PDB file of N, CA, C and O in Angstrom:
ATOM      1  N   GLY A 952       2.168-106.012  96.510  1.00  0.00           N
ATOM      2  CA  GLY A 952       3.347-105.736  97.591  1.00  0.00           C
ATOM      3  C   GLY A 952       4.227-106.858  97.203  1.00  0.00           C
ATOM      4  O   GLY A 952       5.479-105.921  96.882  1.00  0.00           O
ATOM      5  N   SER A 953       4.498-107.796  97.899  1.00  0.00           N
ATOM      6  CA  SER A 953       5.520-108.592  96.967  1.00  0.00           C
ATOM      7  C   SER A 953       7.010-108.208  97.965  1.00  0.00           C
ATOM      8  O   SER A 953       7.531-107.708  97.305  1.00  0.00           O
ATOM      9  N   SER A 954       6.927-108.530  99.219  1.00  0.00           N
ATOM     10  CA  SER A 954       7.915-107.991  99.872  1.00  0.00           C
ATOM     11  C   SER A 954       7.750-109.033 101.122  1.00  0.00           C
ATOM     12  O   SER A 954       8.834-109.493 101.746  1.00  0.00           O
ATOM     13  N   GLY A 955       6.762-109.583 101.943  1.00  0.00           N
ATOM     14  CA  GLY A 955       6.810-109.745 102.945  1.00  0.00           C
ATOM     15  C   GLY A 955       6.754-111.599 103.096  1.00  0.00           C
ATOM     16  O   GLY A 955       7.656-112.113 103.119  1.00  0.00           O
ATOM     17  N   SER A 956       5.739-111.736 101.885  1.00  0.00           N
ATOM     18  CA  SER A 956       5.945-113.279 101.802  1.00  0.00           C
ATOM     19  C   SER A 956       7.269-113.706 101.210  1.00  0.00           C
ATOM     20  O   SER A 956       7.718-114.634 101.382  1.00  0.00           O
ATOM     21  N   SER A 957       7.216-112.748  99.891  1.00  0.00           N
ATOM     22  CA  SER A 957       8.548-112.946  98.872  1.00  0.00           C
ATOM     23  C   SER A 957       9.966-113.332 100.042  1.00  0.00           C
ATOM     24  O   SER A 957      10.479-114.448  99.892  1.00  0.00           O
ATOM     25  N   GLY A 958      10.204-112.501 100.998  1.00  0.00           N
ATOM     26  CA  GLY A 958      11.179-112.517 101.561  1.00  0.00           C
ATOM     27  C   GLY A 958      11.013-113.858 102.611  1.00  0.00           C
ATOM     28  O   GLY A 958      12.071-114.127 103.578  1.00  0.00           O
ATOM     29  N   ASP A 959       9.605-114.365 102.725  1.00  0.00           N
ATOM     30  CA  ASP A 959       9.781-115.019 103.770  1.00  0.00           C
ATOM     31  C   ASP A 959      10.030-116.346 103.094  1.00  0.00           C
ATOM     32  O   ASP A 959      10.570-117.367 103.891  1.00  0.00           O
ATOM     33  N   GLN A 960       9.378-116.580 101.831  1.00  0.00           N
ATOM     34  CA  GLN A 960       9.748-117.898 100.964  1.00  0.00           C
ATOM     35  C   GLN A 960      11.163-117.935 101.051  1.00  0.00           C
ATOM     36  O   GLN A 960      11.873-118.601 100.392  1.00  0.00           O
ATOM     37  N   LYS A 961      12.229-116.594 100.887  1.00  0.00           N
ATOM     38  CA  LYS A 961      13.256-116.540 100.799  1.00  0.00           C
ATOM     39  C   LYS A 961      14.398-117.227 101.674  1.00  0.00           C
ATOM     40  O   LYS A 961      15.261-117.809 101.102  1.00  0.00           O
ATOM     41  N   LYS A 962      13.859-116.966 103.036  1.00  0.00           N
ATOM     42  CA  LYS A 962      14.615-117.771 103.529  1.00  0.00           C
ATOM     43  C   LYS A 962      14.451-119.361 103.686  1.00  0.00           C
ATOM     44  O   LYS A 962      15.314-119.847 104.043  1.00  0.00           O
ATOM     45  N   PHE A 963      13.194-119.631 103.422  1.00  0.00           N
ATOM     46  CA  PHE A 963      12.583-120.882 103.377  1.00  0.00           C
ATOM     47  C   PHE A 963      13.400-121.441 102.204  1.00  0.00           C
ATOM     48  O   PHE A 963      14.183-122.601 102.447  1.00  0.00           O
ATOM     49  N   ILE A 964      13.142-121.082 101.146  1.00  0.00           N
ATOM     50  CA  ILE A 964      14.070-121.820  99.813  1.00  0.00           C
ATOM     51  C   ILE A 964      15.482-121.874  99.928  1.00  0.00           C
ATOM     52  O   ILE A 964      15.988-122.351  99.473  1.00  0.00           O
ATOM     53  N   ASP A 965      15.734-121.036 100.400  1.00  0.00           N
ATOM     54  CA  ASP A 965      17.461-120.413 100.955  1.00  0.00           C
ATOM     55  C   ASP A 965      17.673-121.700 101.944  1.00  0.00           C
ATOM     56  O   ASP A 965      18.669-122.497 101.276  1.00  0.00           O
ATOM     57  N   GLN A 966      17.073-121.910 102.604  1.00  0.00           N
ATOM     58  CA  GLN A 966      17.339-123.126 103.518  1.00  0.00           C
ATOM     59  C   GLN A 966      17.335-124.474 102.793  1.00  0.00           C
ATOM     60  O   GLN A 966      18.288-125.351 103.160  1.00  0.00           O
ATOM     61  N   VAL A 967      16.423-124.584 101.777  1.00  0.00           N
ATOM     62  CA  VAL A 967      16.747-125.762 100.968  1.00  0.00           C
ATOM     63  C   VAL A 967      18.072-125.759 100.313  1.00  0.00           C
ATOM     64  O   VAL A 967      18.503-126.816  99.898  1.00  0.00           O
ATOM     65  N   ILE A 968      18.055-124.748  99.419  1.00  0.00           N
ATOM     66  CA  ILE A 968      19.270-125.050  98.467  1.00  0.00           C
ATOM     67  C   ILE A 968      20.428-125.324  98.982  1.00  0.00           C
ATOM     68  O   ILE A 968      20.947-126.233  98.780  1.00  0.00           O
ATOM     69  N   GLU A 969      20.346-124.752 100.647  1.00  0.00           N
ATOM     70  CA  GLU A 969      21.645-125.677 101.227  1.00  0.00           C
ATOM     71  C   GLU A 969      21.748-127.045 101.223  1.00  0.00           C
ATOM     72  O   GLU A 969      23.022-127.578 100.920  1.00  0.00           O
ATOM     73  N   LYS A 970      20.409-127.889 101.498  1.00  0.00           N
ATOM     74  CA  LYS A 970      20.403-128.839 101.409  1.00  0.00           C
ATOM     75  C   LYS A 970      20.899-129.472  99.830  1.00  0.00           C
ATOM     76  O   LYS A 970      21.840-130.513  99.776  1.00  0.00           O
ATOM     77  N   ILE A 971      20.353-128.667  99.046  1.00  0.00           N
ATOM     78  CA  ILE A 971      20.715-129.075  97.596  1.00  0.00           C
ATOM     79  C   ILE A 971      22.238-128.922  97.281  1.00  0.00           C
ATOM     80  O   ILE A 971      22.738-129.915  96.980  1.00  0.00           O
ATOM     81  N   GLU A 972      22.806-127.542  97.816  1.00  0.00           N
ATOM     82  CA  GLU A 972      24.001-127.761  97.386  1.00  0.00           C
ATOM     83  C   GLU A 972      24.708-128.909  98.047  1.00  0.00           C
ATOM     84  O   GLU A 972      25.680-129.690  97.449  1.00  0.00           O
ATOM     85  N   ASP A 973      24.754-129.047  99.345  1.00  0.00           N
ATOM     86  CA  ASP A 973      25.273-130.188 100.022  1.00  0.00           C
ATOM     87  C   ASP A 973      25.097-131.518  98.999  1.00  0.00           C
ATOM     88  O   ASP A 973      26.122-132.458  98.967  1.00  0.00           O
ATOM     89  N   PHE A 974      23.949-131.723  98.754  1.00  0.00           N
ATOM     90  CA  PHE A 974      23.719-132.781  98.193  1.00  0.00           C
ATOM     91  C   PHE A 974      24.574-133.215  97.104  1.00  0.00           C
ATOM     92  O   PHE A 974      24.683-134.253  96.420  1.00  0.00           O
ATOM     93  N   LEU A 975      24.528-131.858  96.017  1.00  0.00           N
ATOM     94  CA  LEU A 975      25.254-131.615  95.127  1.00  0.00           C
ATOM     95  C   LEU A 975      26.899-131.965  95.029  1.00  0.00           C
ATOM     96  O   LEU A 975      27.543-132.743  94.345  1.00  0.00           O
ATOM     97  N   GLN A 976      27.112-131.406  96.362  1.00  0.00           N
ATOM     98  CA  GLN A 976      28.637-131.632  96.745  1.00  0.00           C
ATOM     99  C   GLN A 976      28.979-133.425  96.631  1.00  0.00           C
ATOM    100  O   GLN A 976      29.962-133.419  95.971  1.00  0.00           O
ATOM    101  N   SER A 977      28.366-133.832  97.601  1.00  0.00           N
ATOM    102  CA  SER A 977      28.474-135.496  97.421  1.00  0.00           C
ATOM    103  C   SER A 977      28.608-136.168  96.551  1.00  0.00           C
ATOM    104  O   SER A 977      27.967-135.813  95.467  1.00  0.00           O
ATOM    105  N   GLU A 978      29.161-137.064  96.220  1.00  0.00           N
ATOM    106  CA  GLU A 978      29.396-137.593  95.137  1.00  0.00           C
ATOM    107  C   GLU A 978      28.290-138.715  94.944  1.00  0.00           C
ATOM    108  O   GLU A 978      27.687-138.906  93.953  1.00  0.00           O
ATOM    109  N   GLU A 979      28.897-139.748  95.976  1.00  0.00           N
ATOM    110  CA  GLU A 979      27.665-140.997  95.883  1.00  0.00           C
ATOM    111  C   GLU A 979      26.276-140.730  95.850  1.00  0.00           C
ATOM    112  O   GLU A 979      25.380-141.456  94.901  1.00  0.00           O
ATOM    113  N   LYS A 980      25.904-139.498  96.627  1.00  0.00           N
ATOM    114  CA  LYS A 980      24.378-139.322  96.370  1.00  0.00           C
ATOM    115  C   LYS A 980      23.879-139.019  94.853  1.00  0.00           C
ATOM    116  O   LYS A 980      24.605-138.387  94.330  1.00  0.00           O
ATOM    117  N   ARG A 981      23.074-139.709  94.659  1.00  0.00           N
ATOM    118  CA  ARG A 981      22.109-139.869  93.329  1.00  0.00           C
ATOM    119  C   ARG A 981      21.019-138.806  93.390  1.00  0.00           C
ATOM    120  O   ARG A 981      20.702-138.622  92.242  1.00  0.00           O
ATOM    121  N   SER A 982      20.074-139.176  94.571  1.00  0.00           N
ATOM    122  CA  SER A 982      18.883-138.388  94.477  1.00  0.00           C
ATOM    123  C   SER A 982      18.802-137.944  95.979  1.00  0.00           C
ATOM    124  O   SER A 982      18.833-138.615  96.945  1.00  0.00           O
ATOM    125  N   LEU A 983      18.185-136.692  96.330  1.00  0.00           N
ATOM    126  CA  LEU A 983      17.983-135.842  97.481  1.00  0.00           C
ATOM    127  C   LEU A 983      16.361-135.893  97.967  1.00  0.00           C
ATOM    128  O   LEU A 983      15.677-135.750  96.657  1.00  0.00           O
ATOM    129  N   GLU A 984      16.297-135.888  98.883  1.00  0.00           N
ATOM    130  CA  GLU A 984      14.802-135.944  99.320  1.00  0.00           C
ATOM    131  C   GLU A 984      14.807-134.525 100.501  1.00  0.00           C
ATOM    132  O   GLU A 984      15.231-134.634 101.370  1.00  0.00           O
ATOM    133  N   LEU A 985      13.534-133.809  99.927  1.00  0.00           N
ATOM    134  CA  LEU A 985      13.225-132.852 100.780  1.00  0.00           C
ATOM    135  C   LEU A 985      11.842-132.799 101.410  1.00  0.00           C
ATOM    136  O   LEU A 985      11.528-134.370 101.350  1.00  0.00           O
ATOM    137  N   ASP A 986      11.493-131.986 102.251  1.00  0.00           N
ATOM    138  CA  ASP A 986      10.649-132.463 103.061  1.00  0.00           C
ATOM    139  C   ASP A 986       9.152-132.229 102.063  1.00  0.00           C
ATOM    140  O   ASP A 986       9.125-131.440 101.092  1.00  0.00           O
ATOM    141  N   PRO A 987       7.970-132.511 102.287  1.00  0.00           N
ATOM    142  CA  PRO A 987       6.747-132.755 101.746  1.00  0.00           C
ATOM    143  C   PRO A 987       6.107-130.981 102.457  1.00  0.00           C
ATOM    144  O   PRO A 987       5.717-130.671 103.394  1.00  0.00           O
ATOM    145  N   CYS A 988       6.015-130.488 101.676  1.00  0.00           N
ATOM    146  CA  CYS A 988       5.373-129.306 100.975  1.00  0.00           C
ATOM    147  C   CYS A 988       3.907-129.337 101.471  1.00  0.00           C
ATOM    148  O   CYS A 988       3.309-130.427 101.102  1.00  0.00           O
ATOM    149  N   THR A 989       3.206-128.388 101.612  1.00  0.00           N
ATOM    150  CA  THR A 989       1.766-128.489 101.909  1.00  0.00           C
ATOM    151  C   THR A 989       0.962-127.841 100.612  1.00  0.00           C
ATOM    152  O   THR A 989      -0.012-128.499 100.382  1.00  0.00           O
ATOM    153  N   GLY A 990       1.457-127.088  99.647  1.00  0.00           N
ATOM    154  CA  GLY A 990       1.046-126.702  98.579  1.00  0.00           C
ATOM    155  C   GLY A 990       2.273-125.440  98.139  1.00  0.00           C
ATOM    156  O   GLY A 990       2.717-125.720  96.954  1.00  0.00           O
ATOM    157  N   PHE A 991       1.383-124.387  98.443  1.00  0.00           N
ATOM    158  CA  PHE A 991       2.285-123.196  98.088  1.00  0.00           C
ATOM    159  C   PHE A 991       3.915-123.225  97.887  1.00  0.00           C
ATOM    160  O   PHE A 991       4.366-123.325  97.305  1.00  0.00           O
ATOM    161  N   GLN A 992       4.511-123.333  99.026  1.00  0.00           N
ATOM    162  CA  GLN A 992       6.035-123.661  99.196  1.00  0.00           C
ATOM    163  C   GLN A 992       6.322-124.509  97.982  1.00  0.00           C
ATOM    164  O   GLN A 992       7.471-124.358  97.647  1.00  0.00           O
ATOM    165  N   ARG A 993       5.764-125.790  98.019  1.00  0.00           N
ATOM    166  CA  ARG A 993       6.086-126.915  97.020  1.00  0.00           C
ATOM    167  C   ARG A 993       6.388-125.995  95.610  1.00  0.00           C
ATOM    168  O   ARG A 993       7.383-126.183  95.274  1.00  0.00           O
ATOM    169  N   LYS A 994       5.433-125.069  95.548  1.00  0.00           N
ATOM    170  CA  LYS A 994       5.453-124.418  94.297  1.00  0.00           C
ATOM    171  C   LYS A 994       6.906-123.541  94.136  1.00  0.00           C
ATOM    172  O   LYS A 994       7.531-123.578  92.703  1.00  0.00           O
ATOM    173  N   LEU A 995       7.144-122.998  95.457  1.00  0.00           N
ATOM    174  CA  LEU A 995       8.114-122.155  95.295  1.00  0.00           C
ATOM    175  C   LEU A 995       9.074-122.928  95.113  1.00  0.00           C
ATOM    176  O   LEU A 995       9.926-122.321  93.958  1.00  0.00           O
ATOM    177  N   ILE A 996       9.503-124.124  95.562  1.00  0.00           N
ATOM    178  CA  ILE A 996      11.083-124.820  95.545  1.00  0.00           C
ATOM    179  C   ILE A 996      10.989-124.848  93.656  1.00  0.00           C
ATOM    180  O   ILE A 996      11.929-124.364  93.508  1.00  0.00           O
ATOM    181  N   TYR A 997       9.865-125.719  93.331  1.00  0.00           N
ATOM    182  CA  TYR A 997       9.704-125.887  91.912  1.00  0.00           C
ATOM    183  C   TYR A 997      10.221-124.652  91.255  1.00  0.00           C
ATOM    184  O   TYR A 997      10.826-124.701  90.114  1.00  0.00           O
ATOM    185  N   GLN A 998       9.562-123.457  91.437  1.00  0.00           N
ATOM    186  CA  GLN A 998       9.819-122.388  90.798  1.00  0.00           C
ATOM    187  C   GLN A 998      11.255-121.980  90.879  1.00  0.00           C
ATOM    188  O   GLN A 998      11.468-121.665  89.775  1.00  0.00           O
ATOM    189  N   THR A 999      11.535-121.740  92.071  1.00  0.00           N
ATOM    190  CA  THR A 999      13.334-121.493  92.578  1.00  0.00           C
ATOM    191  C   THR A 999      13.970-122.283  91.819  1.00  0.00           C
ATOM    192  O   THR A 999      14.888-122.160  90.803  1.00  0.00           O
ATOM    193  N   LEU A1000      14.178-123.699  92.068  1.00  0.00           N
ATOM    194  CA  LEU A1000      14.591-124.808  90.779  1.00  0.00           C
ATOM    195  C   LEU A1000      14.679-124.755  89.584  1.00  0.00           C
ATOM    196  O   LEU A1000      15.626-124.981  88.834  1.00  0.00           O
ATOM    197  N   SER A1001      13.755-124.001  89.171  1.00  0.00           N
ATOM    198  CA  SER A1001      13.158-123.376  87.991  1.00  0.00           C
ATOM    199  C   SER A1001      14.407-122.838  87.108  1.00  0.00           C
ATOM    200  O   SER A1001      14.863-122.975  85.895  1.00  0.00           O
ATOM    201  N   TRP A1002      14.934-121.848  87.966  1.00  0.00           N
ATOM    202  CA  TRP A1002      15.792-121.052  87.671  1.00  0.00           C
ATOM    203  C   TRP A1002      17.061-121.490  88.254  1.00  0.00           C
ATOM    204  O   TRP A1002      18.326-121.291  87.768  1.00  0.00           O
ATOM    205  N   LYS A1003      16.724-121.749  89.428  1.00  0.00           N
ATOM    206  CA  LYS A1003      17.880-122.129  90.376  1.00  0.00           C
ATOM    207  C   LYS A1003      18.881-123.383  89.965  1.00  0.00           C
ATOM    208  O   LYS A1003      20.108-123.496  90.039  1.00  0.00           O
ATOM    209  N   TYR A1004      17.967-124.362  89.000  1.00  0.00           N
ATOM    210  CA  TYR A1004      18.648-125.533  88.626  1.00  0.00           C
ATOM    211  C   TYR A1004      17.379-126.097  87.434  1.00  0.00           C
ATOM    212  O   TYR A1004      16.774-127.006  87.718  1.00  0.00           O
ATOM    213  N   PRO A1005      17.742-125.432  86.479  1.00  0.00           N
ATOM    214  CA  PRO A1005      16.849-125.668  84.991  1.00  0.00           C
ATOM    215  C   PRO A1005      17.549-127.241  84.592  1.00  0.00           C
ATOM    216  O   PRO A1005      16.658-128.324  84.500  1.00  0.00           O
ATOM    217  N   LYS A1006      18.640-127.198  84.143  1.00  0.00           N
ATOM    218  CA  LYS A1006      19.843-128.217  83.909  1.00  0.00           C
ATOM    219  C   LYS A1006      20.555-128.804  84.643  1.00  0.00           C
ATOM    220  O   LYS A1006      21.674-128.192  84.827  1.00  0.00           O
ATOM    221  N   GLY A1007      20.346-130.220  84.891  1.00  0.00           N
ATOM    222  CA  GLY A1007      21.387-130.887  86.119  1.00  0.00           C
ATOM    223  C   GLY A1007      20.876-131.599  87.322  1.00  0.00           C
ATOM    224  O   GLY A1007      21.690-132.307  87.301  1.00  0.00           O
ATOM    225  N   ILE A1008      19.607-131.162  87.487  1.00  0.00           N
ATOM    226  CA  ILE A1008      18.993-132.063  88.375  1.00  0.00           C
ATOM    227  C   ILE A1008      17.682-132.675  88.099  1.00  0.00           C
ATOM    228  O   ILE A1008      16.896-131.343  87.014  1.00  0.00           O
ATOM    229  N   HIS A1009      17.087-133.474  88.750  1.00  0.00           N
ATOM    230  CA  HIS A1009      15.517-134.170  88.268  1.00  0.00           C
ATOM    231  C   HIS A1009      14.838-133.707  89.539  1.00  0.00           C
ATOM    232  O   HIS A1009      14.908-134.653  90.373  1.00  0.00           O
ATOM    233  N   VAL A1010      13.736-132.586  89.456  1.00  0.00           N
ATOM    234  CA  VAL A1010      12.853-132.564  90.487  1.00  0.00           C
ATOM    235  C   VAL A1010      11.701-133.381  90.526  1.00  0.00           C
ATOM    236  O   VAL A1010      11.000-133.552  89.422  1.00  0.00           O
ATOM    237  N   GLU A1011      11.341-134.356  91.087  1.00  0.00           N
ATOM    238  CA  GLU A1011      10.102-135.335  91.339  1.00  0.00           C
ATOM    239  C   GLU A1011       9.419-134.941  92.696  1.00  0.00           C
ATOM    240  O   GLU A1011      10.000-135.187  93.764  1.00  0.00           O
ATOM    241  N   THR A1012       8.254-135.643  92.402  1.00  0.00           N
ATOM    242  CA  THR A1012       7.345-135.453  93.505  1.00  0.00           C
ATOM    243  C   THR A1012       6.655-136.873  93.633  1.00  0.00           C
ATOM    244  O   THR A1012       5.782-137.696  93.043  1.00  0.00           O
ATOM    245  N   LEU A1013       7.040-137.655  94.565  1.00  0.00           N
ATOM    246  CA  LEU A1013       6.793-139.204  95.351  1.00  0.00           C
ATOM    247  C   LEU A1013       6.276-139.321  96.202  1.00  0.00           C
ATOM    248  O   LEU A1013       6.587-138.104  97.391  1.00  0.00           O
ATOM    249  N   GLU A1014       5.213-140.102  96.344  1.00  0.00           N
ATOM    250  CA  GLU A1014       3.937-139.916  97.286  1.00  0.00           C
ATOM    251  C   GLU A1014       4.243-141.628  98.039  1.00  0.00           C
ATOM    252  O   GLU A1014       4.236-142.738  97.190  1.00  0.00           O
ATOM    253  N   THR A1015       4.457-141.774  99.540  1.00  0.00           N
ATOM    254  CA  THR A1015       4.699-143.077 100.027  1.00  0.00           C
ATOM    255  C   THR A1015       3.115-143.118 101.137  1.00  0.00           C
ATOM    256  O   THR A1015       2.376-142.386 100.822  1.00  0.00           O
ATOM    257  N   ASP A1016       3.616-143.930 101.910  1.00  0.00           N
ATOM    258  CA  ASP A1016       2.741-144.271 103.270  1.00  0.00           C
ATOM    259  C   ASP A1016       2.728-143.172 104.089  1.00  0.00           C
ATOM    260  O   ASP A1016       1.981-142.263 104.451  1.00  0.00           O
ATOM    261  N   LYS A1017       3.891-142.907 105.050  1.00  0.00           N
ATOM    262  CA  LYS A1017       4.486-142.023 105.798  1.00  0.00           C
ATOM    263  C   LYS A1017       5.201-140.854 104.996  1.00  0.00           C
ATOM    264  O   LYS A1017       4.580-139.811 105.552  1.00  0.00           O
ATOM    265  N   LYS A1018       5.931-141.024 103.880  1.00  0.00           N
ATOM    266  CA  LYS A1018       6.776-140.068 103.449  1.00  0.00           C
ATOM    267  C   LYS A1018       5.882-139.367 102.586  1.00  0.00           C
ATOM    268  O   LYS A1018       5.925-138.027 102.443  1.00  0.00           O
ATOM    269  N   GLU A1019       4.668-139.849 102.156  1.00  0.00           N
ATOM    270  CA  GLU A1019       3.598-139.238 101.298  1.00  0.00           C
ATOM    271  C   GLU A1019       4.424-138.257 100.505  1.00  0.00           C
ATOM    272  O   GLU A1019       5.561-138.547 100.053  1.00  0.00           O
ATOM    273  N   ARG A1020       3.660-137.709  99.892  1.00  0.00           N
ATOM    274  CA  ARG A1020       3.589-136.851  98.909  1.00  0.00           C
ATOM    275  C   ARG A1020       4.949-135.694  99.196  1.00  0.00           C
ATOM    276  O   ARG A1020       4.875-134.903  99.546  1.00  0.00           O
ATOM    277  N   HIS A1021       6.489-135.954  98.891  1.00  0.00           N
ATOM    278  CA  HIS A1021       7.646-135.528  99.010  1.00  0.00           C
ATOM    279  C   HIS A1021       8.381-134.799  98.010  1.00  0.00           C
ATOM    280  O   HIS A1021       8.352-135.830  97.069  1.00  0.00           O
ATOM    281  N   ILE A1022       9.270-133.903  97.814  1.00  0.00           N
ATOM    282  CA  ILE A1022       9.726-133.770  96.868  1.00  0.00           C
ATOM    283  C   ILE A1022      10.892-134.396  96.884  1.00  0.00           C
ATOM    284  O   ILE A1022      11.699-134.508  98.162  1.00  0.00           O
ATOM    285  N   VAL A1023      11.879-134.669  95.526  1.00  0.00           N
ATOM    286  CA  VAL A1023      12.671-135.467  95.404  1.00  0.00           C
ATOM    287  C   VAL A1023      13.383-134.860  94.142  1.00  0.00           C
ATOM    288  O   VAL A1023      12.965-134.859  93.148  1.00  0.00           O
ATOM    289  N   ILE A1024      14.953-134.782  94.540  1.00  0.00           N
ATOM    290  CA  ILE A1024      15.914-134.164  93.511  1.00  0.00           C
ATOM    291  C   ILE A1024      16.691-135.450  93.092  1.00  0.00           C
ATOM    292  O   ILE A1024      16.785-136.483  93.811  1.00  0.00           O
ATOM    293  N   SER A1025      17.011-135.515  91.746  1.00  0.00           N
ATOM    294  CA  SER A1025      17.919-136.448  91.253  1.00  0.00           C
ATOM    295  C   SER A1025      18.972-135.962  90.631  1.00  0.00           C
ATOM    296  O   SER A1025      18.924-134.731  90.430  1.00  0.00           O
ATOM    297  N   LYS A1026      20.282-136.938  90.420  1.00  0.00           N
ATOM    298  CA  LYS A1026      21.030-135.892  89.315  1.00  0.00           C
ATOM    299  C   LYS A1026      20.976-136.228  88.058  1.00  0.00           C
ATOM    300  O   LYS A1026      20.319-137.475  87.586  1.00  0.00           O
ATOM    301  N   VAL A1027      21.053-135.046  87.385  1.00  0.00           N
ATOM    302  CA  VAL A1027      20.944-135.454  86.308  1.00  0.00           C
ATOM    303  C   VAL A1027      22.075-134.752  85.205  1.00  0.00           C
ATOM    304  O   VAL A1027      23.054-134.019  85.810  1.00  0.00           O
ATOM    305  N   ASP A1028      22.419-134.648  84.171  1.00  0.00           N
ATOM    306  CA  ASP A1028      23.444-134.508  83.063  1.00  0.00           C
ATOM    307  C   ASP A1028      22.648-133.555  81.826  1.00  0.00           C
ATOM    308  O   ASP A1028      21.660-133.923  81.441  1.00  0.00           O
ATOM    309  N   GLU A1029      23.834-133.063  81.415  1.00  0.00           N
ATOM    310  CA  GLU A1029      23.390-131.821  79.921  1.00  0.00           C
ATOM    311  C   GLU A1029      23.456-133.168  78.989  1.00  0.00           C
ATOM    312  O   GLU A1029      22.474-133.317  78.417  1.00  0.00           O
ATOM    313  N   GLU A1030      24.521-133.594  79.025  1.00  0.00           N
ATOM    314  CA  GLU A1030      24.628-134.644  77.513  1.00  0.00           C
ATOM    315  C   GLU A1030      23.331-135.597  77.715  1.00  0.00           C
ATOM    316  O   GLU A1030      22.735-135.580  76.693  1.00  0.00           O
ATOM    317  N   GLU A1031      23.339-136.604  78.497  1.00  0.00           N
ATOM    318  CA  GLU A1031      22.141-137.401  78.780  1.00  0.00           C
ATOM    319  C   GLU A1031      21.059-136.585  77.964  1.00  0.00           C
ATOM    320  O   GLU A1031      20.357-137.056  77.020  1.00  0.00           O
ATOM    321  N   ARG A1032      20.339-135.478  78.389  1.00  0.00           N
ATOM    322  CA  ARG A1032      19.406-134.947  78.070  1.00  0.00           C
ATOM    323  C   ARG A1032      19.431-134.645  76.597  1.00  0.00           C
ATOM    324  O   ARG A1032      20.574-134.010  76.232  1.00  0.00           O
ATOM    325  N   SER A1033      18.504-134.866  76.077  1.00  0.00           N
ATOM    326  CA  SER A1033      18.531-134.808  74.790  1.00  0.00           C
ATOM    327  C   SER A1033      18.436-133.438  73.997  1.00  0.00           C
ATOM    328  O   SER A1033      19.390-132.838  73.320  1.00  0.00           O
ATOM    329  N   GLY A1034      17.723-132.460  74.589  1.00  0.00           N
ATOM    330  CA  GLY A1034      17.598-131.237  74.802  1.00  0.00           C
ATOM    331  C   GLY A1034      15.932-130.657  74.731  1.00  0.00           C
ATOM    332  O   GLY A1034      15.212-131.366  75.398  1.00  0.00           O
ATOM    333  N   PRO A1035      15.880-129.604  74.096  1.00  0.00           N
ATOM    334  CA  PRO A1035      14.848-129.246  74.068  1.00  0.00           C
ATOM    335  C   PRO A1035      13.275-130.252  73.243  1.00  0.00           C
ATOM    336  O   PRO A1035      13.696-130.826  71.671  1.00  0.00           O
ATOM    337  N   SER A1036      12.447-130.055  73.728  1.00  0.00           N
ATOM    338  CA  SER A1036      10.986-131.086  72.948  1.00  0.00           C
ATOM    339  C   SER A1036      10.761-131.027  71.828  1.00  0.00           C
ATOM    340  O   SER A1036      10.835-130.831  70.791  1.00  0.00           O
ATOM    341  N   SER A1037       9.982-129.244  72.121  1.00  0.00           N
ATOM    342  CA  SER A1037       9.454-128.648  70.843  1.00  0.00           C
ATOM    343  C   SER A1037      10.166-128.942  69.601  1.00  0.00           C
ATOM    344  O   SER A1037      10.234-129.765  68.382  1.00  0.00           O
ATOM    345  N   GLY A1038      11.733-128.390  69.789  1.00  0.00           N
ATOM    346  CA  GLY A1038      12.781-128.367  68.789  1.00  0.00           C
ATOM    347  C   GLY A1038      12.362-127.233  67.731  1.00  0.00           C
ATOM    348  O   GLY A1038      13.387-127.193  66.821  1.00  0.00           O
TER     349      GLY A1038
END
């Protein structure tokens, strides 16, 4: 099928994007913190950002006490990055 769920995660992901955009806009901002996904959604985020933002930001999953495992983004640069691992 791929329509209901897709369109469902589309609104969710989109909502996230906004957060990203804003975060990207801000200068001081160095790392953004997203909400802790349950599982599927989490994969979605990463999936989207996979193409939505392959090079430029760094997505990481940090886990705390109350914050628990939550998605976190960071400011990345092209230059900094060496390039492809394989080579």
